[PDB]
Design a binder for this molecule. Structure first.
Ligand SMILES: NC[C@@H]1O[C@H](O[C@H]2[C@@H](O)[C@H](O[C@@H]3[C@@H](O)[C@H](N)C[C@H](N)[C@H]3O[C@H]3O[C@H](CO)[C@@H](O)[C@H](O)[C@H]3N)O[C@@H]2CO)[C@H](N)[C@@H](O)[C@@H]1O
Ligand SMILES: [Mg+2]
Ligand SMILES: [Mg+2]
Lengths: 72, 65, 90
RNA sequence: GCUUUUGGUCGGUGGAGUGAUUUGUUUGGUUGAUUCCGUCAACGGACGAGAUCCAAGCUGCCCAGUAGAAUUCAGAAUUGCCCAUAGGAUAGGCAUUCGUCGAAUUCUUCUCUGCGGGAUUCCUUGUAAUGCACAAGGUGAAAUUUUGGGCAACAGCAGGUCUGUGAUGCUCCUCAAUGUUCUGGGCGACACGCGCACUACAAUGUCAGUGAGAACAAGAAAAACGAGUCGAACCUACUUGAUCAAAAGAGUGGGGAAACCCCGGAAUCACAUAGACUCACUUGGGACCGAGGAUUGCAAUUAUUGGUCGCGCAACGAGGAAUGUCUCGUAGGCGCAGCUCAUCAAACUGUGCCGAUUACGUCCC
RNA sequence: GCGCGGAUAGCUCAGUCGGUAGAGCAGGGGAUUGAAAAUCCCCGUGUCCUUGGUUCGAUUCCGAGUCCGCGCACCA
């Protein structure tokens, strides 16, 4: 089946800003099955967390972008 | 698993020639009972002499030729 | 170091072929480096075939679980299946 | 073409046997090789193998207004205080850049290429044990037939070709001809079974952008029609069409082809593109067919081909029993030329690009 | 109607005496393999015949009852 949502609910966007910066090794496919959202949202949700400095961009390419938590 | 050293390659064996008959020295820790023991065993894969390999049951010896 | 620990654990130390019955035969150190690399690229390739996960994650998961010697790796399921068949085909 | 990618065949004179026939042509090592060394009732030869020939890799001389390079004055451009919306990794006497359709004045580094060097198991230290040679390493651009092809004896197959020829014997047809030309069909028709490709089944991807950037190659015409000389047929850049889709349609140049296409802007690939999709028969796949339109042709119907918008609800989610090819710039992937060609490549002959896994073994099939 | 045994996946069957099911074998996959049979490794799968007393918890303990075997019974 694998029915993923195509936009955020208010409940799961609160999961995006809280649990995801606590993870180590954030990728848009790790977020896609933990949060049950499409990768087109999960990649868009993680670009938002970099400009707020909540997560770190550890490796970037045009297709694959790997994120990590910021340790401070 | 004991690590033994190939001191002699005795020729390509089996029907298809994929198995190699070697003579492997067991290389134990020199105070051991089974030190400087040499065994005649079958090796699967490309093997030259002086190539170490791991052995599960060292008490078997293969039938030569 | 995680890769060299994955290659070192990735391939079976023993195997079984017909030399004459199905006798258990030792595996050379060259093939053990070949078959470890072969069975990790395999299996990580089959994981990501119709998966949400990218190939650099599925390849990174096979290398990690084989480095730890966990059975979650594809290679370590086949590394242990071959050695127990070789132990019974002695 | 195939017996056959094999190392094989033939005389002479001598020996052997009543003879067909043997010997030479071999038991031993050796090599891809009846290739060599040794033995030897044989001794001397001939062919095949090797050699020669082509192509590729390194190189000498010659060489260039049909190949290219540096410099030096002039001309032009950037020129620093600058840290992307969130902005990582990575060289640094006289800063740098070039239809700028500049002048000069010195060159062969790359390019082209006629003959020529270079490779021989040459050197080295285990195998073998005189020998012929072999393995590992050196040397080197290249290391063992250097690589890749061409050419290939003797016998033979009742293989294919009488659809290649003004190659042919025999035999059939021979004026409402089985001759030869028109016109129209057919070779292509589809319950089906098989060879061979092509395209996929997707995220190591599809799309839309953007960058870097190949080699082999092709290219126009006649005792015709036109102005013994020249034109037009062929391929092409460039402008145009364009105060508005492609596909076109037009001008204007150039090229007989190292001189023009051309600084040959191939496609894989690449990209820190802060691009869309997010695991679905789905933005995978593009079969099927509907409607405009434009070119090839004397003629497009049983769509010639391209292009545009539809269709995509056509299987197809990696394939049963079986099966094919391959050992290094290779397999696989990727395109491009030429050839068929007025128009048409899922073909074949070539060429480049990206570039591995495995074995370096054996006689199991 | 008397005592003994049998009931446990499709087939087959040992149970810990009242703390959760097992092997045997068949059904779908890779391996052997050039192709075999056999051999292997891997994924199905039984509310454990019905009832209760329901011992912390009933295939296991216990009280009846259906079913099936043997050896025995026997005056409306
Ligand atoms: N004319 C050469 C012939 O080579 C033959 O020998 C050839 C065979 O032993 C062998 O040829 C084999 C072939 O059998 C087999 N069917 C296919 C294989 N690829 C070939 O291999 C040969 O050719 C290719 C070149 O493409 C190379 O890979 C390889 O180095 C080479 N050994 O290698 C030799 C070719 O070098 C015979 N000795 C003889 O018929 C003749 O000398
Ligand atoms: Mg004679
Ligand atoms: Mg089938």
């Amino acid at each position: 089946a694998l029915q993923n949502a195509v936009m955020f609910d208010k409940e799961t966007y609160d999961k995006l800003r809280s649990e995801v910066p606590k993870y180590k090794l954030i990728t848009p496919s790790i977020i896609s099955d933990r949060l049950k959202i499409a990768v087109s949202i999960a990649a868009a949700g993680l670009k938002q967390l970099c400009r707020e400095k909540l997560i770190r961009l550890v490796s970037c390419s045009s297709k694959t972008r790997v994120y990590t938590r910021i340790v401070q | 698993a004991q690590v033994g050293l190939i001191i002699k390659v005795l020729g390509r064996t089996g029907s298809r020639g994929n198995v190699t008959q070697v003579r492997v020295r067991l290389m134990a820790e020199a105070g051991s009972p089974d030190y400087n023991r040499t065994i005649v065993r079958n090796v699967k894969g490309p093997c030259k002499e002086n190539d170490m390999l791991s052995l599960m049951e060292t008490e078997r010896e293969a039938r030569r030729l | 170091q995680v890769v060299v620990d994955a290659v070192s654990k990735g391939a079976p130390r023993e195997d079984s072929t017909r030399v004459g019955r199905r006798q258990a035969v030792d595996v050379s150190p060259m093939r053990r480096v070949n078959e470890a690399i072969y069975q990790m690229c395999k299996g990580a390739r089959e994981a990501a075939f119709r998966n949400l996960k990218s190939m650099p994650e599925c390849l990174a998961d096979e290398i990690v679980n084989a480095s730890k010697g966990s059975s979650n790796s594809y290679a370590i399921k086949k590394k242990d299946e071959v050695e127990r068949v070789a132990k019974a085909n002695r």
